[PDB]
Design a protein around this nucleic acid. Structure first.
Ligand SMILES: [Mg+2]
Ligand SMILES: [Mg+2]
Ligand SMILES: [Mg+2]
Ligand SMILES: [Mg+2]
Ligand SMILES: [Mg+2]
Ligand SMILES: [Mg+2]
Ligand SMILES: [Mg+2]
Ligand SMILES: [Mg+2]
Ligand SMILES: [Mg+2]
Ligand SMILES: [Mg+2]
Ligand SMILES: [Mg+2]
Lengths: 132, 138, 51
RNA sequence: CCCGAGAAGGGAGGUGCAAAGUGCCUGAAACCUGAUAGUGAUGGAACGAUACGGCAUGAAAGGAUCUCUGGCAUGAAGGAAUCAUUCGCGAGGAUGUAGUACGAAUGUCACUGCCAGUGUCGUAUCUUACGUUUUGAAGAACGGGCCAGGGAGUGUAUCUU
RNA sequence: AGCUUGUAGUCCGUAAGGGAGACAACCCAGCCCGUGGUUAAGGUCCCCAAGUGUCGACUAAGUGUUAAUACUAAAGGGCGU
RNA sequence: UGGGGCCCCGAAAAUUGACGGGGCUCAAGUCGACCACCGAUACCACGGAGUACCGCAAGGUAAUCUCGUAGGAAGGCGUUGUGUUCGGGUCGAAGCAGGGCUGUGAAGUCCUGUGGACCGUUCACAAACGAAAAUCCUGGUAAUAGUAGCAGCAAAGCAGG
RNA sequence: CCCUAACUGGAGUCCGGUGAAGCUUACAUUCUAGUGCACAGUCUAGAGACCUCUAGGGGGAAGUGAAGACCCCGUGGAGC
C-alpha cells in the first residue's frame, strides 16, 4: 500500500508501452494451427519459398527488434511495480517497496509463504501473488 | 419506386445499384420492359442471343428471359451480391413489368442522367423487345 | 559395436518402404543411428583424451 | 446385501491419507464417446493476420486516475467550412477570412464500472500450405494419414591461423 | 520460337507494401514498430474510395473499353465519315 | 489529285465465357488539353525499438543507418551433468491440461486442477545437448467402414421331442 | 453378329451375426475462361450451388499400386 514512485517521463513511457504492447502480435510459429504436432513458440522461417519468411503482410509479423518495449519501463509489471522473484525470506532484506513489488516462489509451501507475506506486510513490499 | 420508361439500361442499373448500396430503401422498378438499350438492333439481339444460349444445362449461366428479371440481373451484376451487402441489396430490389396492382397510385422518381433522350441517335431497342425476341412472355 | 553387430541389409526400392538396413528375416530396421536400437552416431570414445 | 444362468460383470457398501482395485505410480497426444459455448440445412475453400461488432466467459494469476463518456490547457506534420473580391469559355483557381476554428499526443478536472484477455460467429482488406529440387512451386514435381518418443559436424594423429 | 549464344544497365534469385483481373523479375517503392497527414504509380458510372468532371472534335463498328509485354492479325481496298 | 484521323471489308476452330464482370454511344470508347479529388509501410511529423561510430561517463550524431537466399561475424534462450555460492519441498517436489504477466524472441515466472518425492539458482565448466520433414525408425491409432470377404470347384436341410 | 430377349443357379440389392485392407499435408458442393514451370476443385473474373442418405457404372482428382524396366548421365557394376 504505497504510491508508485514513477516520474511523469516514466509514466508516459509506461502508457506508451501499454498501447504498443497491446498492439503487439503474438508471434506464433508459421502453420502452427494446421498441424497438432507444432507448438505455439516462435521458430524462424527457413524455407526459400515460405510466405512468412518473405514477409507477406497477410501471413503475420516477423520477430524483430522494432517491436521492442521502451527501455525505461521494460520488464515492469502491468501494475507498474517492478518484479523481484522471491525464492526465500532472505531476499526481502534487499528490496525496497518504494517502486518495486515481490513475486513469491511457486514451490513455496504455506508454512514459509505465510512468514514471507507477514514480513512483507510489516516491511511494506508489494506482493503480487497471495491469498485472502 | 423508379419508373424505367425511356431510360438507359446500364445507367439506370448503375444508379439503382449505388442507391441500394447506400443501404436503406426498397427500390421498385416498374415498366421494366420499356427500358432502352443503345446500339444497333442487330448487334443488341446478337449479343443477347449469344448470352441467352451460353451455359451448360447442369452448370451454365441460366440467363433469364423476362424483362424484369433481365433488369434485375443487370442490377445484380453491378453489386457485390455474393456478399451480405449484395444479398441485402438484391433482397431490397423488386422489378416489375408494367404496373403491379399495389403500385397503382404510388409516387415515382425517374433518373435524370439515365434518360434516353440524352442519346443522339435512333439506334436503340427496348428491353421488352429483347426479352420478347428471347422467347419471353410478359 | 553397440547397435552394429547385426547383419542387416537394405531392401532396395520397389517395396514402398524406406532404404534403411533391415533384418534378413524380418522388416525391422537395424544398425543405423535413427533405427530403433541402432548405433549412436558420434558417441563418446574411451580413447578420447580429456586431460 | 441386490441384479445376473454365472467364482464373469454391475450397483450398494467397506479397507486405504490416496483406488493406486491385480502389466494396478504419475497417466500426455493421436483416436473414440458425451456435455457446454458459438454458428448451422442460401452456402466458397490454405482454415490465418489486422480492425470493428453479436453471443458465452473473465474466481486466481492482469488494470482501479484502470474502463466508459465529456470540459479545460499546450498542441508537431497538415488545415478547413462559410462569406467577400477578382480571374477563368468552363470544371475551378488566386487573394482575404486564416496558418484561424481544428488536429496525433502530452497534462489536469469531472463522469462512469467496466476493460485487457479467452472461446466461437459475422462484417471489411490481404494471403493459392510447409520443407526440398528448382532460373522459376499452390503445382497436374518430390516427402509427410495422425500423435508420442529415437534420429544427423564425433574422436585420434598431424599442419595452419 | 516463352529458341540458342553474347554484351551495357537494372531486376528476380534473395524483394515486402501499393497498382496493373490474376502476373518471380512491368510502374510507384526499396521495408524497424504505433499514430496522424499528404502524395507516388494508377484510377474516379457500379462491382470499388474518389468525377454520370470541363473544354474542342472524332467513332456507329459493342470497333473500343489491352502502357511494357511470350498476353495485341497482315498485304490490299473503301463515292464509310 | 496529294497528305492525314477514326472506322469498315479482308477476318474461319473446335466444353458455354471473358473489356477483369455488369454495362456503356455529344460515352463509361479514341484524340488534343485542363480542373478537382481518391490512393502506399514512399515523403513529412510525433512517440518508441535496434544498430553503426565517437565520448571516461552522462550522452552525441545518422538526408548521407534499418529488406534479404548461399555464407561470414557477434550476442543470447533451453536440456543433462560437474566444481562452487545461495536455496525450495508431504503446511506438498518433479511431470501433466488450461490460463495471467514479462520479454522483439528463444523462453522465464506466476495461478487453477491432478500428483505423491524430489527440485533449482550465482559464478564457471563439459556434453550421448534442442526436430516438422530423411518413400526416416519403434509404438499407439484413425478415415476407408460396420464396407469387402464369410458365394463360383460337392447350391442341404425340414418336422417333432 | 444383324439385335437382342426370356429363363435357371450363385453373387449383387434388403435384413440378422461376424468383420479386415489399400490411396490420405490441409480444406473441399462445383462449372467455364484466363493466369501460373506453358495440363487449376483451392489463384483471378464470372456462373451456379439448401443439406443428408441409398443404388449405379466409372467422366475427373494429370485416381492407387512403384525411387521408370525406354533415352541420357555416373572417370558405378556384372556377364560375355
Ligand atoms: Mg542398444
Ligand atoms: Mg537456388
Ligand atoms: Mg524428439
Ligand atoms: Mg527492370
Ligand atoms: Mg535485388
Ligand atoms: Mg509486387
Ligand atoms: Mg545466412
Ligand atoms: Mg516427430
Ligand atoms: Mg446369402
Ligand atoms: Mg529415379
Ligand atoms: Mg567425369
Amino acid at each position: 500500500v504505497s504510491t508508485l514512485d514513477m516520474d511523469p517521463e516514466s509514466r508516459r513511457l509506461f502508457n506508451v508501452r501499454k498501447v504498443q504492447k497491446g498492439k503487439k502480435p503474438q508471434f506464433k510459429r508459421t502453420c502452427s494451427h494446421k498441424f497438432k504436432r507444432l507448438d505455439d513458440n516462435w521458430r524462424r522461417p527457413r524455407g526459400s519459398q515460405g510466405k512468412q519468411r518473405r514477409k507477406y503482410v497477410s501471413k503475420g509479423a516477423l520477430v524483430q527488434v522494432g517491436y521492442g518495449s521502451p527501455a525505461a519501463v521494460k520488464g515492469l509489471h502491468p501494475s507498474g511495480y517492478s518484479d523481484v522473484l522471491i525464492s526465500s525470506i532472505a531476499e526481502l532484506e534487499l528490496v525496497d517497496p518504494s517502486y518495486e513489488a515481490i513475486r513469491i516462489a511457486g514451490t513455496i509451501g504455506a508454512q514459509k509463504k505465510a512468514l514471507i507475506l507477514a514480513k512483507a506486510e510489516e516491511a511494506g513490499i508489494k506482493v503480487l501473488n497471495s491469498g485472502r | 419506386v423508379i419508373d424505367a420508361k425511356g431510360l438507359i439500361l446500364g445507367r439506370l442499373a448503375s444508379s439503382v445499384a449505388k442507391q441500394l448500396l447506400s443501404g436503406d430503401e426498397k427500390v421498385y422498378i416498374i415498366n421494366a420492359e420499356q427500358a432502352i438499350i443503345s446500339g444497333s438492333r442487330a448487334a443488341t439481339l446478337r449479343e443477347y442471343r449469344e448470352t441467352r444460349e451460353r451455359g451448360a444445362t447442369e452448370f451454365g449461366p441460366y440467363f433469364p428471359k423476362r424483362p424484369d428479371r433481365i433488369l434485375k440481373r443487370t442490377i445484380r451484376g453491378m453489386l457485390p451480391y455474393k456478399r451480405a451487402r449484395g444479398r441485402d441489396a438484391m433482397s431490397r430490389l423488386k422489378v416489375y413489368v408494367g404496373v403491379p396492382y399495389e403500385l397503382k397510385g404510388a409516387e415515382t422518381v425517374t433518373i435524370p442522367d439515365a434518360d434516353m433522350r440524352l442519346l443522339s441517335s435512333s439506334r436503340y431497342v427496348e428491353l421488352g423487345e429483347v426479352s420478347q425476341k428471347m422467347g419471353s412472355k410478359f | 559395436y553397440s547397435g552394429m553387430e547385426t547383419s542387416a541389409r537394405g531392401w532396395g526400392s520397389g517395396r514402398g518402404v524406406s532404404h534403411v538396413p533391415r533384418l534378413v528375416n524380418s522388416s525391422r530396421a537395424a544398425r543405423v543411428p535413427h533405427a530403433k536400437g541402432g548405433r549412436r552416431a558420434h558417441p563418446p570414445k574411451p580413447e578420447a583424451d580429456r586431460s
